[PDB]
C-alpha cells in the first residue's frame, strides 16, 4: 500500500467519528465508606451496571435494594463525598480485546500501565459471560507442552483442560508458570500456527516489584511479544482483584472464539476470595463458613468452567486455564483448596520437603493426576510415559527399606538405583524449558536403565551433554520424532545403540 | 398480564413486588424483557405483598420494576419419550440444539412422595459385572445406591461403567441427571452414548434421558435441576410399569448449592455452614426416589466427600436413605487397584444370609475377615517384617494380598488410561473364584497374576504363560 493511499484512509477514518449523548439518570450517595457507596434513587439501574462518579472513577452497581443501591468504588475513594453525583453509563462491565493486547501490561479494568502509549483496540467484550454449552465443547486431544520433563511425562496437559498448580509459599508455583511461557516462544517463531499458544498472566494481590521483575524476564528472553499481563495489586481495591480474573478470562475468549489457542494463568485465587470476601462483608451480606460468602464456590466454578475446547464448527479454538492456589501449611483439607480441586481436572501438588532435598521442580507424583491422561501425549511419549510411572511407583515403596538395610536383593538394588536415576533425571533448573522431542530421548534412556551405569551425580550433566551431542550429529532423528510424532522401530534401534555408546564415549563416572 | 415487578436484586436472590393474588410458594414466575428466559421459584412470603425467589439464570441485566408474570403453577418440564436421548435444562429448555421437545403433557417438579401403604419394596440382585461389588456390596434392583468418593477418586468413571454395563440391554428406560459437575464430562458422556448407540438422532430410539446441571449454571438451578430429572423418571415409572435406571451424578452439589443461597435467604448457618433444612430438603428428594406398585426405579447416585471427611453432615445423613453403599478409598488408588471400592466401609442391605445364598454370604465375610486380619498385621510388619511372623500369619498376609489385588478389575471406561480391554464377570464365576482362593487354590501361584483379572481361570492361565515365557 502506497503511503498516500494509507494517509487518505487514515484521514477519512478520523472524519467518520460519531458521538451521541442521551439523558442518563443520576443519583446521590447516601453514604460512602471502605469503597462501598449507598446511592439514593438512581432507579431503573441494571445489576453490575457501570456508573461514574464526580471525580471520574467508575463503579459497579451490585446490590439493588428497594431503599438504596450498593455500589463498589472501582478505584481510590478519597474524593467521594456525601451527596455527590453518580451517573449510570448503561453498559455492563467490559474490557478491550484483540491482538494488540499482546506485548502490553494492563490492570483489572484493562488500562495499560506500561506507560508506552494508549491502547489501539476497537473490540470490547463483556467481562462476565455465560460459559459454553455442552455441544460447543470438544474432547481434548491436543498437547500443551509446558517444557517440564516431569509434567509433560507424568502429568500431561492437553489444550482445553484445567490443571491446578497447588502448593505452599515459595514452592515453585510461579516457576512452573514462567517455564511454560518460555517454552511456547519457540513455537511462535516458527511458522506453525497450529501450535502457537498465546499466554495470559493474571496477577492478583501481588507486589508491583515482583510483577516488574516478571515482565523484565519475559523481555529478556523475548517471550513478552505473545504475553498479556493483567495486574491487580494489593493496593488495588478488592473489586479490581475480584474482576481481574474474569477480565483476563474474557481476553482469552477472543482467541478461543477465533479458532486460536490461548493460555490463561490465574495467580493465587485465595487472594481473590479475600477480596471477594471483603467485598461481600462490606456490603452487609450474611457471611458463611470462614467469613466467606455462601456463593464463593460459584465464583471459581463460573470462572474456570469457561475454559474448554471449542468444536471445529466454531473454529476449533481452545482456552487452557492454570489456576494457582497457595496453602498455609500444606493443608489441602481447607475449604477453598478443596473446592478448587474438585472444579479443575488435575492438580500439581508441590511439597516443601522435596524442594529442600534437591528435588526441584518439587512435584509429588503420588498425588498429581490428570483426567486427559495419555489422550494428550504424543505416540512417542505414551509408550515411554506408561513404563515411567510404574518404575517411579516401585521406587517410592523401596524408599523405606533403604533405611532398614542390612540386605538388598540383586533386583531390588537395580530397582532402587533405576528409580534414583529417574528422580535425578526429572529435576530441572529454573528458566530452562526443554523441547518435547528432547525430553523423549532423555526420558527414554532413564526407563531403559542406561542411566544406572554412570553415577547419579553425573546424570544431570549427562542430560545436557547428551542432548547437545544429539542436536549436532543426530539431527535427522530429531526431525522424524518431531514431524511424525512417533518413535519408530528404526529410531529405537539407533537410539538404543547410541545411548550405551555415548556413555562410554564421554568422560563420566561409569562405576555405579 | 404481569402482576408482579422486580423490586430487589442481590446476587442470585430476586424479590418481586405483587399488587394482588400473590403466587403460592414454589410457583414459577416469568420475567418479561430479559434476553433469556428467566424463571423465579417462590420460596418465602415476606409480607406486604412481597415474595423472595431464587433466579435460575444469571441475574445480570435485570432492572428494578421489571414486570413479572405469574404462571400459577410450579416449574413444569416436558415429560414423555420426547426427552429420551435429549439434553434438557432445569426449566425444560433443550440445550442440545436439536429443536423443541415434544411432550404429551407437562408435570410439575414438586410433588408429594408416595404413601407408606403403597411402598411395595422388593429385593433383587443386580449383576453389574463388577466382582468386588457383586460379592461384598450387592445391589438391589429398585433400591438406592450410593457411591461415596472424594475428589479425583474414580467415582465418575465408575458411573460410566455402570451405564455401559447396566443401561444397555435394559428393557426399560434410563435417566442421567448430572448436577454441579464440570461440563467437559457432559460432552464426553454425550459423545460416548452417541458412539455407543445408547442415544441417536433417529426417533423411536435412544432409550435413555440426559439431564445436566453443570457448574456453568448459577445457584438455584443446580439445586432444582435434580428435581427435573427425577420428574422424567417418575413419568416413565407411573405411566408405564417399566424399570427405570436413574444415574445421578455427584449429589453433594445439591446440598452445597442450597447453602450458597441459604445465607442470603435469611437462614442462620449450620455447624458446617449448611442450611438448617439440610435433613428436610434431602428427605423430600430421597423419599421420592423409590419403587412403588406402578413401577420401580434403580437410582445410582454418587456422593462427593469433600476433603475425604465422611463426618460431614451432608453425606452422613445420606447413608440413612441408601440401600446399597459403595465407599471409595483413596489408599487403594495409590496402590493401583481399580475400582477403589473400600471392602470394609462398603455395605449392602442385601448382604443377609436369608436374602442371598448362604454360600455367597459365607465367602463375603471370609474375605472381610481375611482383609481385616491382614490390616492389623501391618503394624507389626512395619517394625519386624513378614519374616518374623508365624506360619499362620504368613498365610493370612499371603492370601490377603492376593485377594486384595484380585479385587482390581479393568473396565471398558478405563482402557484409555490403562490400555487393557474391559471385562465382564458373572456372579457365579465371581463367587466361585473367591471361594477357591479362600480354600488356597491359588496360594501356590505368585500374587502378581491376581491383579486386574476377571476370573480366577484367567489368572491361572496368565501364571502358566509367564512360566513358559521365562
Amino acid at each position: 500500500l502506497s503511503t498516500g493511499e494509507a494517509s487518505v484512509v487514515l484521514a477519512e477514518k478520523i472524519k467518520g467519528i460519531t458521538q451521541q449523548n442521551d439523558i442518563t439518570e443520576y443519583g446521590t450517595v447516601i453514604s460512602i465508606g471502605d469503597g462501598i457507596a449507598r446511592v439514593f434513587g438512581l432507579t431503573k439501574v441494571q445489576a453490575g451496571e457501570m456508573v461514574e462518579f464526580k471525580s471520574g472513577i467508575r463503579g459497579m452497581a451490585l446490590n439493588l435494594e428497594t431503599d438504596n443501591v450498593g455500589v463498589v468504588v472501582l478505584g481510590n475513594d478519597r474524593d467521594i463525598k456525601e451527596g455527590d453525583v453518580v451517573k449510570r453509563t448503561g453498559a455492563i462491565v467490559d474490557v478491550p480485546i484483540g491482538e494488540a493486547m499482546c506485548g502490553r501490561v494492563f490492570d483489572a479494568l484493562g488500562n495499560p500501565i506500561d506507560g508506552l502509549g494508549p491502547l489501539k483496540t476497537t473490540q470490547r467484550a463483556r467481562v462476565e459471560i455465560k460459559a459454553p454449552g455442552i455441544i460447543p465443547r470438544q474432547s481434548v486431544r491436543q498437547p500443551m507442552q509446558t517444557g517440564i520433563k516431569c509434567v509433560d511425562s507424568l502429568v500431561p496437559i492437553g489444550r482445553g483442560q484445567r490443571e491446578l498448580i497447588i502448593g505452599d509459599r515459595q514452592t515453585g508455583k510461579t516457576a512452573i508458570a514462567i517455564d511454560t511461557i518460555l517454552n511456547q516462544k519457540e513455537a511462535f517463531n516458527t511458522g506453525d500456527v497450529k501450535k502457537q499458544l498465546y499466554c495470559i498472566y493474571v496477577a492478583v494481590g501481588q507486589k508491583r516489584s515482583t510483577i516488574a521483575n516478571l515482565v523484565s524476564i519475559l523481555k529478556q528472553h523475548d517471550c513478552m511479544k505473545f504475553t498479556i499481563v493483567v495486574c491487580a495489586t494489593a493496593s488495588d481495591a478488592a473489586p479490581l482483584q475480584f474482576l481481574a480474573p474474569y477480565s483476563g478470562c474474557a481476553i482469552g475468549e477472543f482467541f478461543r472464539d477465533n479458532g486460536k489457542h490461548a493460555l490463561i494463568i490465574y495467580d493465587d485465587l485465595s487472594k481473590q476470595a479475600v477480596a471477594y470476601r471483603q467485598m461481600s462483608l462490606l456490603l452487609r451480606r450474611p457471611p458463611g463458613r470462614e467469613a466467606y460468602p455462601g456463593d464463593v464456590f460459584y465464583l471459581h466454578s463460573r470462572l474456570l468452567e469457561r475454559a474448554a475446547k471449542m468444536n471445529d464448527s466454531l473454529g476449533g479454538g481452545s482456552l487452557t486455564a492454570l489456576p494457582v492456589i497457595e496453602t498455609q501449611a500444606g493443608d489441602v483439607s481447607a475449604y477453598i483448596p478443596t473446592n478448587v480441586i474438585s472444579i479443575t481436572d488435575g492438580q500439581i501438588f508441590l511439597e516443601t520437603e522435596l524442594f529442600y532435598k534437591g528435588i526441584r521442580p518439587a512435584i509429588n507424583v503420588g498425588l498429581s493426576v490428570s483426567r486427559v491422561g495419555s489422550a494428550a501425549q504424543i505416540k512417542a511419549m505414551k509408550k515411554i510415559a506408561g513404563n515411567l510411572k510404574l518404575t517411579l511407583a516401585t521406587y517410592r515403596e523401596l524408599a523405606a527399606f533403604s533405611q532398614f538395610g542390612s540386605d538388598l536383593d540383586a533386583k531390588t538394588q537395580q530397582q532402587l538405583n533405576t528409580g534414583e536415576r529417574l528422580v535425578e533425571m526429572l529435576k530441572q533448573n529454573q528458566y530452562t524449558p526443554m523441547k518435547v522431542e528432547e525430553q523423549v530421548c532423555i526420558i527414554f534412556a532413564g526407563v531403559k536403565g542406561f542411566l544406572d551405569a554412570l553415577v547419579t551425580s553425573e546424570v544431570l550433566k549427562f542430560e545436557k551433554k547428551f542432548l547437545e551431542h544429539v542436536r549436532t550429529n543426530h539431527s535427522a532423528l530429531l526431525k522424524r520424532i518431531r514431524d511424525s510424532g512417533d518413535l519408530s522401530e528404526v529410531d529405537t534401534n539407533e537410539l538404543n545403540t547410541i545411548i550405551p555408546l555415548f556413555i562410554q564415549e564421554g568422560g563420566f563416572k561409569l562405576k555405579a | 398480564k404481569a402482576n408482579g415487578q422486580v423490586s430487589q436484586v442481590i446476587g442470585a436472590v430476586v424479590d418481586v413486588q405483587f399488587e394482588g393474588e400473590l403466587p403460592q410458594i414454589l410457583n414459577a414466575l416469568e420475567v418479561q424483557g430479559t434476553q433469556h428466559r428467566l424463571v423465579l421459584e417462590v420460596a418465602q412470603h415476606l409480607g406486604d405483598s412481597r415474595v423472595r425467589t431464587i433466579a435460575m439464570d444469571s441475574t445480570e441485566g435485570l432492572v428494578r420494576g421489571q414486570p413479572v408474570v405469574d404462571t400459577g403453577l410450579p416449574i413444569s418440564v416436558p415429560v414423555g419419550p420426547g426427552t429420551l436421548g435429549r439434553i434438557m435444562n432445569v426449566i425444560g429448555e433443550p440445550i442440545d440444539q436439536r429443536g423443541p421437545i415434544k411432550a404429551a403433557k407437562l408435570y410439575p417438579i414438586h410433588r408429594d412422595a408416595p404413601s407408606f401403604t403403597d411402598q411395595a419394596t422388593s429385593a433383587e440382585i443386580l449383576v453389574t459385572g463388577i466382582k468386588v461389588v457383586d460379592l461384598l456390596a450387592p445391589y438391589a434392583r429398585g433400591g438406592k445406591i450410593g457411591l461415596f468418593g472424594g475428589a479425583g477418586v474414580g467415582k465418575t468413571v465408575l458411573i460410566q461403567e455402570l451405564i455401559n454395563n447396566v443401561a444397555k440391554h435394559h428393557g426399560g428406560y434410563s435417566v442421567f441427571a448430572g448436577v454441579g459437575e464440570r461440563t467437559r464430562e457432559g460432552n464426553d458422556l454425550y459423545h460416548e452414548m452417541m458412539d455407543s448407540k445408547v442415544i441417536s438422532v433417529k426417533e423411536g430410539e435412544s432409550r435413555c434421558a440426559l439431564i445436566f446441571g453443570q457448574m456453568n449454571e448459577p445457584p438455584g438451578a443446580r439445586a432444582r435441576v435434580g428435581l427435573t430429572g427425577l420428574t422424567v423418571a417418575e413419568y416413565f415409572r407411573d405411566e408405564e410399569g417399566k424399570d427405570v435406571l436413574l444415574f445421578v451424578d455427584n449429589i453433594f452439589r445439591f446440598t452445597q448449592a442450597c447453602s450458597e443461597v441459604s445465607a442470603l435467604l435469611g437462614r442462620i448457618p449450620s455447624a458446617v455452614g449448611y442450611q438448617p433444612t439440610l435433613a428436610t430438603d434431602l428427605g423430600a428428594l430421597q423419599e421420592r426416589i423409590t419403587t412403588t406398585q406402578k413401577g420401580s426405579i434403580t437410582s445410582v447416585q454418587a456422593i462427593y466427600v469433600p476433603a475425604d471427611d465422611l463426618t460431614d453432615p451432608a453425606p452422613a445423613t445420606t447413608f440413612a436413605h441408601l440401600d446399597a453403599t459403595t465407599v471409595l478409598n483413596r489408599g487403594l488408588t495409590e496402590l493401583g487397584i481399580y475400582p477403589a471400592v473400600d471392602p470394609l466401609d462398603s455395605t449392602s442391605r442385601m448382604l443377609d444370609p436369608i436374602t442371598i445364598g448362604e454360600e455367597h454370604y459365607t465367602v463375603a465375610r471370609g474375605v472381610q475377615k481375611l482383609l481385616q486380619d491382614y490390616k492389623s498385621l501391618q503394624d507389626i510388619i512395619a517394625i519386624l517384617g513378614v519374616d518374623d511372623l508365624s506360619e499362620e500369619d504368613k498365610l493370612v498376609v499371603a492370601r490377603a494380598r492376593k485377594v486384595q489385588k484380585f479385587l482390581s478389575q479393568p473396565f471398558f471406561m478405563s482402557e484409555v488410561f490403562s490400555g487393557i480391554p474391559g471385562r465382564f464377570v458373572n456372579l457365579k464365576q465371581n463367587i466361585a473364584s473367591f471361594k477357591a482362593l479362600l480354600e488356597g487354590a491359588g496360594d501356590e501361584y505368585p500374587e502378581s497374576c491376581f491383579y486386574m483379572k476377571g476370573d480366577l481361570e484367567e489368572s491361572l492361565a496368565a501364571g502358566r504363560a509367564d512360566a513358559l515365557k521365562s
Binding site: 493443608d331 483439607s333 | 503394624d379 517394625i383 519386624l384
Partner: peptide, 27 residues
Amino acid sequence: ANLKQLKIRMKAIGSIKKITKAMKMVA
C-alpha cells in the same frame, strides 16, 4: 490445627508403643 492429622499421628504412636511394649515382653 487440622485435628484429623494429629489424631492419626497419635494413633500411630499408640501402635508403636504397643508393639514396642510387646517386644519388651518377648525380650
